[PDB]
RNA sequence: UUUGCUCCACACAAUAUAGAUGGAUACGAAUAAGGCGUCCUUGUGGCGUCGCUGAACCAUAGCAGGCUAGCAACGGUGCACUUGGCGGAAAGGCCUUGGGUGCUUGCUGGCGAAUUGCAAUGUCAUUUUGCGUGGGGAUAAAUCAUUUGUAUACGACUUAGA
RNA sequence: CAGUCAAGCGUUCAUAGCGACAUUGCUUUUUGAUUCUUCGAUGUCGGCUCUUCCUAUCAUACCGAAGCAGAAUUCGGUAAG
RNA sequence: AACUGGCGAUGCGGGAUGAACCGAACGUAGAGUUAAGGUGCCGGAAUACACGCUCAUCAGACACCACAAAAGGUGUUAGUU
């Protein structure tokens, strides 16, 4: 119905720095530097006291006052990343093949490798996205730890193990086997 | 108006420059047309690419070489587009369209000319904001042009020459300007800005 | 100096026509520099010279000339109705006709 | 009304027109594509087709049932006397090839 | 074309029996007297046993606005036929005029409910000028304390066909 | 170190916003924005300006940077009150925006005689300035 | 085989100009953003200003632009030459290095223009050549006929033959 | 040939799979109804041969869903390569 | 088979095309104005002005007319307690 102005307020902890041009943020921070493009948006920012940021849609629809609020969760998630991080925690469920899981080097790209998925000859490799850390965290069996700065890799990796774990021809009910993620948490939490 | 116009392609919705194109070139005027690859088409790339298909999906059964010949270059889905805006069967249709000339990039004797946009063609002033649109390159290359990756280099090379000449012409204005503020604000310059100038 | 010229730039679009059917006997001009009726009106009465060239000389010259005058506006964008003593050829299409400033009133 | 019982095409429409070629020499349609990493080298030779002959060869496929085992097996021929360069061509790339 | 405000007085036609009948009175939107006494006369066919052969119209005049160049809301109430059934419904305007504010309820209508002219009876305009009397949150959101907003994107209109420099929008 | 934004503000509709009718009976005159009708709409008052008080799409005037204080749906009076106390006319004519507009009149505004006389200065600065260019 | 074939001009001589009548006047880019100028922290910023159309900019005064005299000025500019290049997307365009020559309306003078008669486009720019003239250049192949058989209905096609 | 609603079937359980009583439809591969073209003639049934097209998909590719434990099935999607 | 108007027997402008629809009926010409229909280009004529709605991985696009339905959808927009 046109609402005439829509504004979201983003708050900035003390110890990171938004750098916004035409719409290219940049957060930096204690943990590093994450770099988003918003061209595609059509939204406008205004920053206040270095601490806060008016994220404003002006005469914009329904469907344009949701990505107001959608790219204010963005950059929410941009500097979560910055100041604290992701952790992706993901268990291998198996009931009779167990399943192998290492980190590989062909040319120097740490690939993620998967054998006896439910038993097969296949190895189901899988890139790690630019800044995600790969952990076979100790003291519990059968965990691995996605961690970095930026959710949407950290996530998307997840994602990618969790995908290419699929169990065909079979009743997914009764064959849970799969790596499922657990726990979506922060590098830093509770520090 | 002018013995030829050169139209920067970029940024311009196909079918308005088409049109845009087709009356001048049926009222006379020469027209050059470059930065084919960078034409815009408003709605989603995937639409224009189904109906790229659709047209592709057309041609005549008993012989496909008679049939209507799909071109793919960005400068030819142009010039379809212009020939259907042209009644190109009559002599006077062909004479438009031998007035017509179109390419992708911009080639040795038109990256060193003057280069106008059509204001009633340009997606950025025509298309609302927040439309999807696809870039006629783009489409192209999906459907089968095989020179994307040629443009776009000899493109990088034309707009780093051009660069540099800009920067020159900079500095030779910038020089001119300040040699000739001692020359300013003299009794001609005075005169004349009483006259208006 | 280098331009001598006298008369302001035009272009015979086309015959007075409907959508199936055309009239040689009256043209249509776009004036350049003219896109309203309103400055079109100031044309209106002027004369008008198609000159073209051939390859037999006539009378001392192989330049032939076609007059005729702006009768009327055309439309809403400059565009204005011309009647010549010849109707002109038809393969002028978009060519290039003279709009004299005479018969002048300023 | 449809076609009675389903059979495939005769032929393949791929090779049409099946013309006479443009000449006896063959001439390469595309090279390997170039990588500036290997050593400077030619792509292709010119022979001469002489005849056919056959061969013995121990053939190793480890899992056939002819592994280890000689196999007779038809071979061409070519001749292929060493060709002389004579001259070199260079190709710009431009937007039409 | 622009509508009109008419306040249309008719009454039955005199008869012997009952002289000076009850004249009755409506304020009619209308694009002319001709078209105002045409609708006076199918509203009171509507409400009353009278028609334009059966009475008289005994006068016609245009009302114009107290204040025409003012802000104020504008409460419509209307009745209009779909093409299921007839509804009555409300909505809330801002203009300067009574009749600039009915024209652009008429487009409203017929952009919204693709509702014709016919098809609409304009059963109320009342003006109010308080809050918290608007309902509609599309005029309470211009009846914000001290509004302002920009126009992003300004598109300028060229006579010219071609332009000899790329376009900017800036407002 | 700072965050830092691009703070892109451009030209807000408001009232007291000062516009330049473009087209219309007045056709380049200053107006104020009295009061927002809408987001297309806004009433505007020209008092000194010679604009009427009156209902207007935005698409009709143009925003000026120049803005002065005033109530929001003040009387004609009271807008021209506060537009010769704010003093906004001479403030629009010192910018170049309306000397552009002023130059552009008067160069229509030129002779034959006149424009013979520009030609012969111009041919004069133009001498003299790539004498300069020449020597220095 | 009468002067051949190949790179510029002329007393001269085509279908004709899909249509000059001062200039087709060169930055990426974004548009909910930029252009220009400046400043300071080996830093992707601050500060000022502009836009709101090319109605601009450049060129433009002289017999379709004649013949001539001066004034501070070494400029601007058309041409036979010479020096760096740069440009391959369809490069066929841009300055300069220097010598020669002509105009200069940058500021001031002297002579001429009629009669085309009151207007008549009132004639000013181009994929070709020739008994012709001169600044210079080398004297080739294809085809038929014969042959061939890696081809072939016939043509064509791989071949050979002083 | 395909939908909509679900009284019921499916040990419980309308909608995994079905689905009555009703009801809304889809090119004409049926057959009618009609008689517009052709009676100074458009060669007719089927088969053989061969090309192409449609998809309302039998198989094959990849998936969703089951009253899918596994195998085997069944219901659907993109799909006529 | 109905009071009728048309085609046949009739061109013309519009409906792209069409016996019948819309407009309008016809001597040969010239000016002006229109009807029906239109004005992005084809194509003569506003890429007019104004308010909305709509984004479709089969959009929609103007009567006769060259088709779509029941049933659905926090797609989006506007409307009672």
């Given at each position: 119905?046109?609402?005439?102005?829509?504004?979201?307020?983003?708050?900035?902890?003390?110890?990171?720095?938004?750098?916004?041009?035409?719409?290219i943020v940049k957060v930096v921070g204690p943990r590093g530097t994450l770099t988003k493009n918003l061209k595609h948006i059509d939204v406008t920012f205004t920053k206040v006291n270095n601490q806060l940021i008016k994220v404003a849609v002006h005469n914009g629809g329904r469907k344009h006052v949701a990505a107001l609020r959608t790219v204010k969760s963005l950059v929410d998630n941009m500097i979560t990343g910055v100041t604290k991080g992701y952790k992706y925690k993901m268990r291998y469920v198996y009931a009779h093949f167990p399943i192998?899981?290492?980190?590989?080097?062909?040319?120097?790209?740490?690939?993620?490798?998967?054998?006896?998925?439910?038993?097969?000859?296949?190895?189901?490799?899988?890139?790690?996205?630019?800044?995600?850390?790969?952990?076979?965290?100790?003291?519990?069996?059968?965990?691995?730890?996605?961690?970095?700065?930026?959710?949407?890799?950290?996530?998307?990796?997840?994602?990618?193990?969790?995908?290419?774990?699929?169990?065909?021809?079979?009743?997914?009910?009764?064959?849970?086997?799969?790596?499922?993620?657990?726990?979506?948490?922060?590098?830093?939490?509770?520090? | 108006v002018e013995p030829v116009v050169v139209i920067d392609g970029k940024g311009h919705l196909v079918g308005r420059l088409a049109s845009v194109v087709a009356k001048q070139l049926l009222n006379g005027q020469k027209i050059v047309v470059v930065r084919a690859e960078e034409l815009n088409i408003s709605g989603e790339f995937f639409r224009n690419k189904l109906k790229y298909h659709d047209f592709l999906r057309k041609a005549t059964a008993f012989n496909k070489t008679r049939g209507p010949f799909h071109f793919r270059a960005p400068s030819r889905?142009?010039?379809?587009?212009?020939?259907?805006?042209?009644?190109?069967?009559?002599?006077?249709?062909?004479?438009?369209?031998?007035?017509?000339?179109?390419?992708?990039?911009?080639?040795?004797?038109?990256?060193?000319?003057?280069?106008?946009?059509?204001?009633?063609?340009?997606?950025?002033?025509?298309?609302?904001?927040?439309?999807?649109?696809?870039?006629?390159?783009?489409?192209?290359?999906?459907?089968?042009?095989?020179?994307?990756?040629?443009?776009?280099?000899?493109?990088?090379?034309?707009?780093?020459?051009?660069?540099?000449?800009?920067?020159?012409?900079?500095?030779?204005?910038?020089?001119?300007?300040?040699?000739?503020?001692?020359?300013?604000?003299?009794?001609?310059?005075?005169?004349?800005?009483?006259?208006?100038? | 100096?280098?331009?001598?010229?006298?008369?302001?730039?035009?272009?015979?679009?086309?015959?007075?026509?409907?959508?199936?059917?055309?009239?040689?006997?009256?043209?249509?001009?776009?004036?350049?520099?003219?896109?309203?009726?309103?400055?079109?009106?100031?044309?209106?009465?002027?004369?008008?010279?198609?000159?073209?060239?051939?390859?037999?000389?006539?009378?001392?010259?192989?330049?032939?000339?076609?007059?005729?005058?702006?009768?009327?506006?055309?439309?809403?964008?400059?565009?204005?109705?011309?009647?010549?003593?010849?109707?002109?050829?038809?393969?002028?299409?978009?060519?290039?006709?003279?709009?004299?400033?005479?018969?002048?009133?300023? | 009304?449809?076609?009675?019982?389903?059979?495939?095409?005769?032929?393949?429409?791929?090779?049409?027109?099946?013309?006479?070629?443009?000449?006896?020499?063959?001439?390469?349609?595309?090279?390997?594509?170039?990588?500036?990493?290997?050593?400077?080298?030619?792509?292709?030779?010119?022979?001469?087709?002489?005849?056919?002959?056959?061969?013995?060869?121990?053939?190793?496929?480890?899992?056939?049932?002819?592994?280890?085992?000689?196999?007779?097996?038809?071979?061409?021929?070519?001749?292929?006397?060493?060709?002389?360069?004579?001259?070199?061509?260079?190709?710009?790339?431009?937007?039409?090839? | 074309?622009?509508?009109?405000?008419?306040?249309?007085?008719?009454?039955?036609?005199?008869?012997?029996?009952?002289?000076?009948?009850?004249?009755?009175?409506?304020?009619?939107?209308?694009?002319?007297?001709?078209?105002?006494?045409?609708?006076?006369?199918?509203?009171?066919?509507?409400?009353?046993?009278?028609?334009?052969?059966?009475?008289?119209?005994?006068?016609?005049?245009?009302?114009?606005?107290?204040?025409?160049?003012?802000?104020?809301?504008?409460?419509?109430?209307?009745?209009?036929?779909?093409?299921?059934?007839?509804?009555?419904?409300?909505?809330?305007?801002?203009?300067?005029?009574?009749?600039?504010?009915?024209?652009?309820?008429?487009?409203?209508?017929?952009?919204?409910?693709?509702?014709?002219?016919?098809?609409?009876?304009?059963?109320?305009?009342?003006?109010?000028?308080?809050?918290?009397?608007?309902?509609?949150?599309?005029?309470?959101?211009?009846?914000?304390?001290?509004?302002?907003?920009?126009?992003?994107?300004?598109?300028?209109?060229?006579?010219?066909?071609?332009?000899?420099?790329?376009?900017?929008?800036?407002? | 170190?700072?965050?830092?934004?691009?703070?892109?503000?451009?030209?807000?509709?408001?009232?007291?916003?000062?516009?330049?009718?473009?087209?219309?009976?007045?056709?380049?005159?200053?107006?104020?924005?009295?009061?927002?009708?809408?987001?297309?709409?806004?009433?505007?008052?020209?008092?000194?300006?010679?604009?009427?008080?009156?209902?207007?799409?935005?698409?009709?005037?143009?925003?000026?940077?120049?803005?002065?204080?005033?109530?929001?749906?003040?009387?004609?009076?009271?807008?021209?009150?506060?537009?010769?106390?704010?003093?906004?006319?001479?403030?629009?004519?010192?910018?170049?925006?309306?000397?552009?507009?002023?130059?552009?009149?008067?160069?229509?505004?030129?002779?034959?005689?006149?424009?013979?006389?520009?030609?012969?200065?111009?041919?004069?600065?133009?001498?003299?300035?790539?004498?300069?260019?020449?020597?220095?």
């Open positions: 119905m046109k609402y005439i102005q829509t504004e979201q307020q983003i708050e900035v902890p003390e110890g990171v720095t938004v750098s916004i041009k035409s719409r192998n899981v290492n980190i590989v080097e062909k040319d120097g790209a740490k690939f993620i490798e998967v054998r006896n998925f439910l038993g097969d000859k296949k190895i189901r490799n899988v890139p790690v996205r630019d800044g995600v850390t790969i952990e076979f965290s100790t003291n519990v069996k059968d965990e691995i730890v996605l961690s970095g700065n930026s959710v949407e890799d950290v996530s998307q990796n997840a994602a990618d193990l969790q995908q290419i774990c699929r169990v065909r021809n079979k009743d997914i009910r009764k064959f849970l086997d799969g790596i499922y993620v657990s726990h979506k948490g922060f590098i830093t939490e509770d520090l | 889905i142009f010039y379809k587009a212009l020939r259907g805006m042209v009644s190109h069967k009559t002599a006077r249709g062909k004479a438009a369209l031998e007035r017509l000339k179109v390419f992708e990039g911009i080639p040795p004797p038109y990256d060193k000319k003057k280069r106008v946009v059509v204001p009633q063609a340009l997606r950025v002033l025509r298309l609302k904001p927040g439309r999807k649109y696809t870039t006629l390159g783009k489409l192209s290359t999906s459907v089968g042009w095989k020179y994307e990756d040629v443009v776009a280099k000899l493109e990088a090379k034309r707009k780093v020459s051009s660069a540099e000449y800009y920067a020159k012409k900079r500095a030779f204005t910038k020089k001119v300007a300040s040699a000739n503020a001692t020359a300013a604000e003299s009794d001609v310059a005075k005169q004349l800005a009483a006259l208006g100038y | 100096a280098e331009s001598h010229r006298l008369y302001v730039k035009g272009k015979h679009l086309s015959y007075q026509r409907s959508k199936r059917v055309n009239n040689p006997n009256v043209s249509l001009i776009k004036i350049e520099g003219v896109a309203t009726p309103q400055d079109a009106q100031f044309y209106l009465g002027k004369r008008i010279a198609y000159v073209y060239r051939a390859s037999k000389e006539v009378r001392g010259s192989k330049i032939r000339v076609m007059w005729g005058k702006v009768t009327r506006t055309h439309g809403n964008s400059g565009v204005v109705r011309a009647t010549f003593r010849n109707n002109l050829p038809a393969k002028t299409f978009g060519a290039s006709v003279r709009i004299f400033l005479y018969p002048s009133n300023i | 009304s449809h076609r009675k019982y389903e059979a495939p095409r005769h032929g393949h429409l791929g090779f049409l027109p099946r013309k006479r070629a443009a000449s006896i020499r063959a001439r390469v349609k595309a090279f390997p594509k170039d990588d500036r990493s290997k050593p400077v080298a030619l792509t292709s030779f010119l022979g001469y087709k002489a005849g056919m002959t056959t061969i013995v060869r121990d053939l190793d496929r480890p899992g056939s049932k002819f592994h280890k085992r000689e196999v007779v097996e038809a071979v061409t021929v070519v001749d292929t006397p060493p060709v002389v360069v004579v001259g070199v061509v260079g190709y710009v790339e431009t937007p039409r090839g | 074309a622009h509508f009109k405000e008419y306040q249309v007085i008719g009454r039955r036609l005199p008869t012997e029996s009952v002289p000076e009948p009850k004249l009755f009175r409506m304020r009619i939107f209308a694009s002319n007297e001709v078209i105002a006494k045409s609708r006076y006369w199918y509203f009171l066919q509507k409400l009353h046993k009278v028609k334009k052969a059966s009475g008289e119209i005994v006068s016609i005049n245009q009302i114009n606005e107290a204040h025409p160049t003012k802000v104020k809301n504008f409460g419509v109430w209307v009745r209009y036929d779909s093409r299921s059934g007839t509804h009555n419904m409300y909505k809330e305007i801002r203009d300067v005029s009574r009749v600039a504010a009915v024209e652009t309820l008429y487009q409203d209508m017929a952009a919204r409910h693709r509702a014709r002219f016919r098809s609409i009876h304009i059963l109320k305009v009342a003006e109010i000028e308080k809050t918290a009397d608007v309902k509609r949150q599309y005029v309470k959101q211009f009846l914000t304390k001290d509004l302002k907003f920009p126009l992003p994107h300004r598109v300028q209109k060229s006579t010219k066909t071609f332009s000899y420099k790329r376009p900017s929008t800036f407002y | 170190t700072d965050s830092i934004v691009k703070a892109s503000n451009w030209r807000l509709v408001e009232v007291g916003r000062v516009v330049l009718i473009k087209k219309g009976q007045s056709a380049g005159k200053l107006a104020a924005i009295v009061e927002i009708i809408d987001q297309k709409k806004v009433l505007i008052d020209g008092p000194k300006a010679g604009v009427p008080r009156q209902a207007i799409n935005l698409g009709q005037v143009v925003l000026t940077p120049l803005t002065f204080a005033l109530p929001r749906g003040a009387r004609t009076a009271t807008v021209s009150k506060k537009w010769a106390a704010a003093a906004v006319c001479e403030k629009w004519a010192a910018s170049s925006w309306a000397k552009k507009i002023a130059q552009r009149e008067r160069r229509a505004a030129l002779t034959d005689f006149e424009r013979f006389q520009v030609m012969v200065l111009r041919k004069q600065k133009r001498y003299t300035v790539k004498k300069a260019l020449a020597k220095a």
